Amino acid sequence: GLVGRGSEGMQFDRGYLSPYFINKPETGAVELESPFILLADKKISNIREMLPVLEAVAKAGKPLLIIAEDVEGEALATLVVNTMRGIVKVAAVKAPGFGDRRKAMLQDIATLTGGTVISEEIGMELEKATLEDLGQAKRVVINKDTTTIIDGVGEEAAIQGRVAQIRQQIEEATSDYDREKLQERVAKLAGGV
């Protein structure tokens, strides 16, 4: 099953949470150059937990892609109004998958991009997130159905280590279904380098 080409980015089947993020109307897509990337494993709905990071990226002068369980209510509303006013170049999408796998893929993305997942179970506060926790990529492209992360800035050794972790998980898998879902994570990681 050789792939006769180089990587084409890490792509997952989640699209923009608002059409007002679209900055490339020709292709109905959001294209962000050198974006910061926020990874959170919970639903973001309060403006309170969104402003700190927003002011941070606004200060650095960089676009931001937010990947969380979901982004809605006042939080989403604040992202939309500020993006339309041109104060920040943001886009929000739901994290891929569900359950434990959703969490594992959020970590795949964090590792690929040099970011840190803002994890609810361990007590991490979104309002306490800093630029250091944000991941980065050369570019991201989001349309109605997908999100593509191009050239994540993660440490090469860390990314290779994550692939090795998944490889071991595959050997320990008990079904072709599980093995293919694990292999899917490997292919996505390989696509983002």
SSE string, helices as H and strands as E: EEEEHEEHEHEEHH
**CATH architecture descriptor:** 3-Layer(bba) Sandwich
How many strands appear in the DSSP assignment? 9
Structural class of the helices, strands and pairings?
A: alpha/beta
Instruction: Quote the beta fraction.
Output: 15-25%
Family: Belongs to the chaperonin (HSP60) family.
Subcellular location: Cytoplasm
Modified residues (N6-succinyllysine): 94, 138
Protein name: Chaperonin GroEL
Describe the structure.
It comes from Escherichia coli (strain K12). Belongs to the chaperonin (HSP60) family. Helices cover 36% and strands 20% of the residues. By secondary structure, the chain is α/β, with parallel strands linked by helices. It has a single domain, classed as 3-Layer(bba) Sandwich (GroEL), CATH 3.50.7.10. α4 runs antiparallel to α5. The longest helix is centred in the C-terminal third of the chain and has 17 residues. It is globular, with a radius of gyration of 16 Å.
Write the layout of secondary structure elements.
Elements (H helix, E strand, L loop, with lengths): L9 E3 L17 E4 L2 E4 L3 E2 L6 H10 L3 E5 L1 E2 L1 H12 L5 E5 L4 H15 L21 E8 L4 E6 L3 H17 L3 H16 L2
Parallel strand pairs: 3-5, 4-6, 5-7
Antiparallel strand pairs: 1-9, 2-8, 3-8, 8-9
PDB class: chaperone
Keywords: Chaperonin, HSP60, GroEL, Cell division, ATP-binding, Phospholyration, chaperone
Assembly: monomeric
